Enzyme design. Structure first.
Site, PDB file in Angstrom:
ATOM      1  N   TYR A   1       1.662   4.097  -7.964  1.00 54.08           N
ATOM      2  CA  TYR A   1       0.337   3.582  -7.631  1.00 54.08           C
ATOM      3  C   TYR A   1      -0.687   4.715  -7.610  1.00 54.08           C
ATOM      4  CZ  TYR A   1       0.851   6.205  -3.320  1.00 54.08           C
ATOM      5  OH  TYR A   1       0.936   7.211  -2.501  1.00 54.08           O
TER       6      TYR A   1
ATOM      7  N   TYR B   1      -6.941   0.945   6.845  1.00 52.92           N
ATOM      8  CA  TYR B   1      -6.930   1.751   7.897  1.00 52.92           C
ATOM      9  C   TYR B   1      -8.036   1.532   8.861  1.00 52.92           C
ATOM     10  CZ  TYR B   1      -3.304   4.223   5.318  1.00 52.92           C
ATOM     11  OH  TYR B   1      -2.366   4.665   4.684  1.00 52.92           O
TER      12      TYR B   1
ATOM     13  N   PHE C   1      -8.136   8.842  -3.822  1.00 53.45           N
ATOM     14  CA  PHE C   1      -7.395   9.513  -2.677  1.00 53.45           C
ATOM     15  C   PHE C   1      -6.105   9.831  -2.861  1.00 53.45           C
ATOM     16  CE2 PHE C   1      -7.620   4.995  -1.523  1.00 53.45           C
ATOM     17  CZ  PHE C   1      -6.267   4.973  -1.047  1.00 53.45           C
ATOM     18  N   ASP C   2      -5.228   9.212  -3.499  1.00 48.99           N
ATOM     19  CA  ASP C   2      -3.637   9.586  -3.639  1.00 48.99           C
ATOM     20  C   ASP C   2      -3.369   8.918  -5.044  1.00 48.99           C
ATOM     21  OD1 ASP C   2      -1.643  11.028  -2.440  1.00 48.99           O
ATOM     22  OD2 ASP C   2      -0.483   9.047  -2.164  1.00 48.99           O
TER      23      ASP C   2
ATOM     24  N   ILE D   1       0.186  -0.452   4.915  1.00 48.22           N
ATOM     25  CA  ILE D   1      -1.033  -1.026   5.370  1.00 48.22           C
ATOM     26  C   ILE D   1      -0.779  -2.637   4.930  1.00 48.22           C
ATOM     27  CG2 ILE D   1      -2.513   0.937   5.330  1.00 48.22           C
ATOM     28  CD1 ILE D   1      -3.466  -0.227   2.688  1.00 48.22           C
TER      29      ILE D   1
ATOM     30  N   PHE E   1      -6.100  -0.110  -4.934  1.00 50.01           N
ATOM     31  CA  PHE E   1      -4.907   0.424  -5.550  1.00 50.01           C
ATOM     32  C   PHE E   1      -4.702  -0.182  -6.853  1.00 50.01           C
ATOM     33  CE2 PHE E   1      -3.345   2.995  -2.379  1.00 50.01           C
ATOM     34  CZ  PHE E   1      -4.135   2.418  -1.102  1.00 50.01           C
TER      35      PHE E   1
HETATM   36  C1  LIG Z   1      -3.186   7.779   8.683  1.00 49.02           C
HETATM   37  O1  LIG Z   1      -3.167   9.022   7.687  1.00 49.02           O
HETATM   38  C2  LIG Z   1      -2.248   9.145   6.868  1.00 49.02           C
HETATM   39  C3  LIG Z   1      -1.336   8.172   6.682  1.00 49.02           C
HETATM   40  C4  LIG Z   1      -0.393   8.397   5.595  1.00 49.02           C
HETATM   41  N1  LIG Z   1       0.718   7.285   5.367  1.00 49.02           N
HETATM   42  C5  LIG Z   1       0.831   6.132   5.873  1.00 49.02           C
HETATM   43  O2  LIG Z   1       0.076   5.590   6.705  1.00 49.02           O
HETATM   44  C6  LIG Z   1       2.175   5.437   5.224  1.00 49.02           C
HETATM   45  C7  LIG Z   1       1.861   4.101   4.828  1.00 49.02           C
HETATM   46  N2  LIG Z   1       0.926   4.125   3.461  1.00 49.02           N
HETATM   47  C8  LIG Z   1       0.270   3.294   3.102  1.00 49.02           C
HETATM   48  O3  LIG Z   1       0.147   2.035   3.591  1.00 49.02           O
HETATM   49  C9  LIG Z   1      -0.529   3.174   1.682  1.00 49.02           C
HETATM   50  C10 LIG Z   1      -0.103   2.132   0.898  1.00 49.02           C
HETATM   51  C11 LIG Z   1       1.048   2.461   0.198  1.00 49.02           C
HETATM   52  C12 LIG Z   1       1.121   3.888  -0.588  1.00 49.02           C
HETATM   53  C13 LIG Z   1       1.024   5.019   0.446  1.00 49.02           C
HETATM   54  N3  LIG Z   1      -0.457   4.557   1.238  1.00 49.02           N
HETATM   55  S1  LIG Z   1      -1.771   5.518   0.941  1.00 49.02           S
HETATM   56  O4  LIG Z   1      -2.913   4.891   1.541  1.00 49.02           O
HETATM   57  O5  LIG Z   1      -1.813   6.039  -0.464  1.00 49.02           O
HETATM   58  C14 LIG Z   1      -1.353   7.019   2.065  1.00 49.02           C
HETATM   59  C15 LIG Z   1      -2.452   7.918   2.039  1.00 49.02           C
HETATM   60  C16 LIG Z   1      -3.497   7.837   3.137  1.00 49.02           C
HETATM   61  C17 LIG Z   1      -4.471   8.901   3.138  1.00 49.02           C
HETATM   62  C18 LIG Z   1      -4.447   9.977   1.874  1.00 49.02           C
HETATM   63  C19 LIG Z   1      -3.571   9.887   1.177  1.00 49.02           C
HETATM   64  C20 LIG Z   1      -2.487   8.964   1.132  1.00 49.02           C
HETATM   65  C21 LIG Z   1      -0.263   9.371   4.626  1.00 49.02           C
HETATM   66  C22 LIG Z   1      -1.340  10.553   4.785  1.00 49.02           C
HETATM   67  O6  LIG Z   1      -1.098  11.360   3.960  1.00 49.02           O
HETATM   68  C23 LIG Z   1      -0.474  11.353   2.975  1.00 49.02           C
HETATM   69  C24 LIG Z   1      -2.159  10.357   5.975  1.00 49.02           C
HETATM   70  O7  LIG Z   1      -3.261  11.476   6.108  1.00 49.02           O
HETATM   71  C25 LIG Z   1      -2.635  12.049   7.071  1.00 49.02           C
END
Ligand SMILES: COc1cc(NC(=O)CCNC(=O)[C@@H]2CCCCN2S(=O)(=O)Cc2ccccc2)cc(OC)c1OC
Ligand SMILES: [Ca+2]
Length: 191
Positions: free
Chosen positions: A111, A167, A121-122, A141, A184
Site C-alpha cells: 500500500y 483516525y 504519509f506511509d 482502521i 490508499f
Molecule cells: C496512531 O498513530 C499511529 C498508528 C500506527 N498504526 C496503526 O494504527 C495500525 C493500523 N494501521 C492502519 O489502520 C493503516 C491502514 C493499514 C496500513 C497501515 N495503516 S497507516 O494509516 O499507513 C499507519 C500509519 C499512520 C501514521 C503514519 C504512518 C503510518 C502507526 C503509526 O506509525 C507507523 C502511528 O503513528 C505513531
C-alpha cells in the site's frame, strides 16, 4: 524555447519531466515506466484524451509548458468509483484473479497512503515489505476492514476513506492531521 516541462499524473501522484521539444516522447515514457518497474508499452499514456505514440514528439503534439499527460499503469480501462453506505469510496484499478478476501482471513498487501493534498504519509513499498492483517478483525482502521474485503490477488484498489473510518479527530503520529480524508492504493498480494 527549446525545452518543455510536462506533468505526468498516474491518478495518485504527479512527477515532472523536462524534455527538448524535438525529443520523441519515448524518452519520457521510458523514464516514467522505469520508475514503476514496468516497460512503457505496458502503460497507457494519454494527452488530451488521445493515446501517445512513442515516436511522437512534443512539437508533433503542439504541447505547451506545464501541460499534463495522464499515465495509466493498471489493467482496467475505464474504471468506476463506488461509494458505499458508509461513505467509503473505492475504485478497482486492476481486478485480480482467484479467491476473494473475506473477513477472518489474513491478507498480505502492498500500500501507499496519501493525504488529499498529495502528501504521502506511509508506504509498504518504501520498506519493500508487504503488510498483513486479519481482515475484519478491527486491527486496522475501519475503512480498510471494509475496503479490502472482496479483493483478489493482483487486484489494485484505491480507497478514499472519510476520517470517521480512519483516525477521526485524533489523527495519527503527528503526520495525519485531525479529520483527514485518507487515500490508499492497495495491492492484494496473498490471501
Ligand atoms: C496512531 O498513530 C499511529 C498508528 C500506527 N498504526 C496503526 O494504527 C495500525 C493500523 N494501521 C492502519 O489502520 C493503516 C491502514 C493499514 C496500513 C497501515 N495503516 S497507516 O494509516 O499507513 C499507519 C500509519 C499512520 C501514521 C503514519 C504512518 C503510518 C502507526 C503509526 O506509525 C507507523 C502511528 O503513528 C505513531
Ligand atoms: Ca511484512
Amino acid at each position: 524555447e527549446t525545452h518543455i516541462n510536462l506533468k505526468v499524473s498516474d491518478g495518485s501522484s504527479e512527477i515532472f519531466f523536462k524534455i527538448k521539444k524535438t525529443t520523441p516522447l519515448r524518452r519520457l515514457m521510458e523514464a516514467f515506466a522505469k520508475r514503476q518497474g514496468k516497460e512503457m508499452d505496458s502503460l497507457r499514456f494519454l494527452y488530451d484524451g488521445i493515446r501517445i505514440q512513442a515516436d511522437q514528439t512534443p512539437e508533433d503534439l503542439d504541447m505547451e509548458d506545464n501541460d499534463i499527460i495522464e499515465a495509466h499503469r493498471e489493467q482496467i480501462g475505464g474504471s468506476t468509483v463506488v461509494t458505499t453506505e458508509s461513505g467509503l469510496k473505492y475504485e478497482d484499478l486492476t481486478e485480480g484473479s482467484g479467491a476473494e478476501a473475506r473477513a477472518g482471513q489474513t491478507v498480505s498487501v502492498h500500500y501507499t497512503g496519501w493525504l488529499t493534498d498529495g502528501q504521502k504519509f506511509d508506504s509498504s513499498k518504501d520498506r519493500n515489505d508487504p503488510f498483513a492483517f486479519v481482515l475484519g478483525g478491527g486491527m486496522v482502521i475501519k475503512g480498510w476492514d471494509e475496503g479490502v474485503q472482496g479483493m483478489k490477488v493482483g487486484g489494485v484498489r484505491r480507497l478514499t476513506i472519510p476520517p470517521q473510518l480512519g483516525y477521526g479527530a485524533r489523527g495519527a503520529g503527528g503526520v495525519i492531521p485531525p479529520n483527514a480524508t485518507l487515500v490508499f492504493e492497495v495491492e492484494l498480494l496473498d490471501v
